[PDB]
Assembly symmetry: D2
Homo-oligomer: 334 residues x 4
């Protein structure tokens, strides 16, 4: 299956990197808003994720990656990308500006692509897939799908384990997040109207909103309407952590919650009892990584509050799932 | 006019000195650290996070002058061997962070010593801990050793007490997103305290850590003894922190009633704001805590409620403002 | 004199702050690309420079600052700003997009302003205050307050010339990161493969014209200096090193010479300060005696002199001084 | 075998490299803390990444891919019984960087009295020396760049400026510096901080023909690792292209070459001692007189450590 990337940014470029070690999926075209020399440089060198494991050499209208040429273009409007020229069936929409069924669908047309995977929430009329949590829902007939938020991919397997063992009454999330491209490097007008993302992202603790908690219902229906949360963006260029304080149906101890998470561990959901820090989870392939050292169960007058926390690298952790769901989606084509 | 001595001319020590200049009834006449006067004079005049000193500091022999008035300096490691009486100092600010107990702080009190001591940190349960404008009434003036509590307790106290005196709290879990501090390593190296996370580079990591402030709230507000607990997330900002508290309350509430309740409880120590500020905005403030209405949450799921309240504090200056207020009040009733 | 600001950014907002404590010049309109609520918030709160010393409350089409409504607009083209409506004679061009004779002149029009001062870099007089402020007569439509680095380098280099004379020199400025860098690795619209990189997590080399275009300020050094930059992770505050061949000198004569040249713009210090210490200062440049070097090897000499400056406030202080002087004449 | 005194940044990274070298093998570590602390700091590394292996803590040590390594906590090196594990020592504490105190058992991982850069003056060693030094991080960078300038064009005099990452000897926040330095007292990760550097003047001990001709200072900046060295010099000869070409010729395993516009993060964890950057080369000719500027990257941690291990390997060979 031949794939195209619209938006060769952080998620776009890292997705490309992971596609190299996945047989049966292959990127043959990239579309951004800049010349090929810029994109080749940004693939080779990466501040947070390290230099590229390969060779990248710039050509005309593209660059070669270990010998295979990949065409690049600078088409701003998705309608005008001739995806069909390079046989691209599926497009990774990673611009962050066409994160809806309506605007993503402008990739699908004559001389266009068949299907689209948005690298972000895509609205409620689009299927939202956290791999190894609800990828079963996919049948292969969907024109537009979404890989969810970075925070949802983290929160899902941790919350799902709580439900399938103890059941959850309600919960409040707090994610301590790395700063991202949508923040200003220094104090300046934010085009999105946010008075906090306007502030210097790398020199401040800056609060902000996140839909991941409320829109969990679309991934795990049994938790619909039960959660809500906010974010605190802090000065690290990548790597985040999600805290969840919840009330559970049953009564629990610290050891049963940790043990329950260990059982639920897989390729996406990790487990650790080492006292790691944010830099330790940079570039990991797990979507989320439960940290047993931070588990709390506070019993006061029979009532219990449970706190569970899990790490995730917003960049690579999410990208790992986006690629897994892309691989699975490409196979059941149709 | 009560004359004071500083043991430990560090972050809290130096800032305390700065604030004591604009308080008439108290005046510092001696400083004791582990270095020459030229080092301490430089660190008073120039301050990365808090700005240059508002005055003139010139180095003399065995001290330095501040706006004319000479202050003696010494380099005595043992508190027992400081001749505090030579400079008439009745009260000592213990800001080394090594003598934070009744027993070890008491080594300031002796012949050729001081009369009383204020520890700039938790000092144990056999020592009264004072959060100013929350429980300073408890003091009578006869106490040899007292404590100004933690930076986080001074923040959490007025926010939690307001919740109790309006709605009552069943239980609560705290999360503080804290600035990095001197007890962390600048880069990955052996921590003398045995902490495998404070061993890590403090300014390049989200680093989880423990905090007693939440549980030891009982010593400040007895009606909340044993009801709270929490953890910390140290993040790369050199000063400025924020405290989140998720709690279950006796009454039912709305967002507006909790904000309004905090506004009522506001004073010189407990601030209030509805502006969407960030961490740098609270650097060098005089309020102990500053409630942020924009971050308030009240989540109703199936009749049950969870309440989230958040407040800023500058671990350095916010705490120091209370430490000085408690010092002023204590000096008067001696 | 009534003034307007086009581009309420770092330099724009700080200029506004300093204009409050100068009587006889006064801002009556701001033009940017966003609503008034955004600009009011960014004036009140400032990460690097501290909270505003005043009161700001948002109204319609503007905000009040200690009283007196100040209009705000979101006009993209300079041609289409009706500056005359609010009586603004002079405009601060701080967008960083109209730094030329032709494009700055689109402020000067029938519905518009009389004159313009661009907040950056030859058809235009380039003025570093207390270094070549003489040059203005008051009849110039467009002028420029030079770069942040030029305002720093000028008084340090001029002192070297007026005492010892300069053969040639190479500059290295260790600069704070700025808004033209990417917060994270992404395509730079300007095509720079280094400002494309995460500005706050890298030492990033970059070019700087300030060194060569010294001739425009002080003709006596024209063509003899050149330099580059190293952008480093601090949100504001920079330092300029200059290694030069000059008479023969000692360390003490160079320091003493700089102290003599000190004034309101050119500072002097012998304290071992660091970048955070110079944040928000009013001096354009601040010579640091502790870093002076004079290396004599086989009769030949190399001289190294270093001076701090806060790209933001240091420069802004001069821009406002030049604006004040220009408004009078 | 080798033993490590000071399992810090340079100590631990040296250990890491020692795994991918046959004929050298570390069997003892001595620091000032328990084995559990050192095992954690080997497994996890903020700047250099997680350890490529398996680490499990035991009694008085920890196992690395099955083989136990002893650990001890002796402050005075005289009383470390190195002979117990057959060690024929990397002095990486930074407190015993002298003939007298290092001799008290050696390769010092830092700077007259002792031999001082692999592939630049490795010939000097014969194998009979009790005390030798791997030089500074900055010298290992500057040496192959300066040596190339001499062996092609010859240099009159030069002034160095190194933009350096912050290091463990700086304070995390403003506080009294043990060493009395009023600038390393300041918050290392929130400031441009000027500092002194011997590397430039003490180049004579590595390249004698340059003795007394160079000098420089440092600017410490907020990055946890990765540095760059600028050198402005006047040469004996009278273009940009010949200097770049000359460096390319001098390139080897230690001295790298690049014409890509990289930044500090790109050189983190590299094995080259120095990496010449052609994009930053300048030659300014004004009135017949010339000034030449040449710049080269180095990761103070791993770049230096790569040489320290290479010189350790070579030194072990000719014992
Ligand atoms: N960065 C993260 O941590 C993270 C995590 C989860 C998902 N995401 C999502 O991934 C997407 C990309 O985020 P990112 O961090 O990579 O952002 P980014 O800014 O790094 O990526 C944007 C890229 O798209 C390009 N672009 C912009 N407008 C375009 C247009 N009209 N047509 C084509 N290309 C255009 C940009 O030049 C750049 O190459 C967003 O939807 C974001 O929400 C990001
Ligand atoms: N930093 C904060 O935000 C904060 C907030 C509240 C409480 N505190 C408490 O304040 C105290 C000081 O913390 P800090 O951040 O100012 O630390 P710091 O490390 O900046 O201050 C310590 C100072 O004490 C000196 N010192 C060490 N041992 C000494 C001794 N035996 N005799 C004399 N001086 C000695 C050090 O040299 C240094 O000058 C600690 O108890 C800390 O827990 C700090
Ligand atoms: N940044 C510094 O420290 C510094 C130092 C020297 C000189 N300068 C120069 O000053 C200028 C301003 O740069 P800055 O650092 O303030 O950047 P900035 O990002 O703060 O300025 C950008 C501002 O201009 C506004 N803007 C953009 N396009 C506009 C348009 N068409 N119409 C109206 N407003 C528009 C933006 O919304 C924003 O408010 C640049 O030329 C810069 O080189 C600044
Ligand atoms: N990393 C660099 O930038 C760099 C550059 C070149 C060489 N070096 C040199 O290497 C040496 C180590 O520096 P580092 O960066 O690894 O520092 P570090 O602080 O990370 O390493 C110090 C280690 O030695 C231990 N130690 C201290 N005193 C000891 C004693 N008396 N006995 C035993 N162990 C003791 C410490 O606890 C710690 O484990 C210094 O001389 C330094 O100048 C480092
Ligand atoms: Mg492939
Ligand atoms: Mg006083
Ligand atoms: Mg005015
Ligand atoms: Mg080996």
């Amino acid at each position: 299956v031949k794939v195209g990337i619209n938006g060769f940014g952080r998620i776009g470029r890292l997705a490309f990197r992971r596609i190299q070690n996945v047989e049966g999926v292959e990127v043959t075209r990239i579309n951004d808003l800049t010349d090929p020399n810029m994109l080749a440089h940004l693939l080779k060198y990466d501040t947070t994720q390290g230099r590229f494991d390969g060779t990248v050499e710039v050509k005309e209208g593209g660059f070669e990656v270990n010998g295979q040429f990949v065409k690049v273009s600078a088409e701003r409007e998705p309608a005008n990308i001739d995806w069909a020229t390079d046989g691209v069936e599926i497009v990774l929409e990673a611009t962050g500006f066409f994160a809806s069924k309506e605007k993503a669908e402008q990739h699908i047309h004559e001389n266009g692509a068949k299907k689209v995977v948005i690298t972000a929430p895509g609205g409620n009329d689009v299927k939202t897939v956290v791999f190894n949590t609800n990828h079963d829902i996919l049948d292969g007939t969907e024109t537009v799908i979404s890989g969810a938020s970075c925070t949802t991919n983290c929160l899902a397997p941790m919350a799902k384990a709580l439900q399938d063992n103890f059941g959850v009454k309600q919960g409040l999330m707090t994610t301590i997040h790395a700063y991202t491209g949508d923040q200003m490097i220094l104090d300046g007008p934010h085009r999105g109207g946010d008075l906090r993302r306007a502030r210097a992202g790398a020199a401040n603790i800056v609060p902000n909103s996140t839909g991941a908690a409320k829109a969990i219902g679309l991934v795990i229906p049994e938790l619909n309407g039960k959660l809500d949360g906010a974010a605190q963006r802090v000065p690290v260029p990548t790597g985040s952590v999600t805290e969840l304080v919840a009330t559970l149906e049953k009564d629990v101890t610290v050891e049963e919650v940790n043990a329950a998470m260990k059982a639920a561990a897989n390729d996406s959901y990790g487990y650790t009892e080492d006292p790691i820090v944010s830099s330790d989870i940079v570039g990991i392939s797990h979507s989320s990584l439960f940290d047993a050292t931070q588990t709390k169960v506070q019993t006061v007058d029979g009532n219990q509050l449970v706190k569970v926390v899990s790490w995730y690298d917003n960049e690579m952790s999410y990208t790992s799932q986006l690629v897994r769901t892309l691989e699975y989606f490409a196979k059941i084509a149709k």
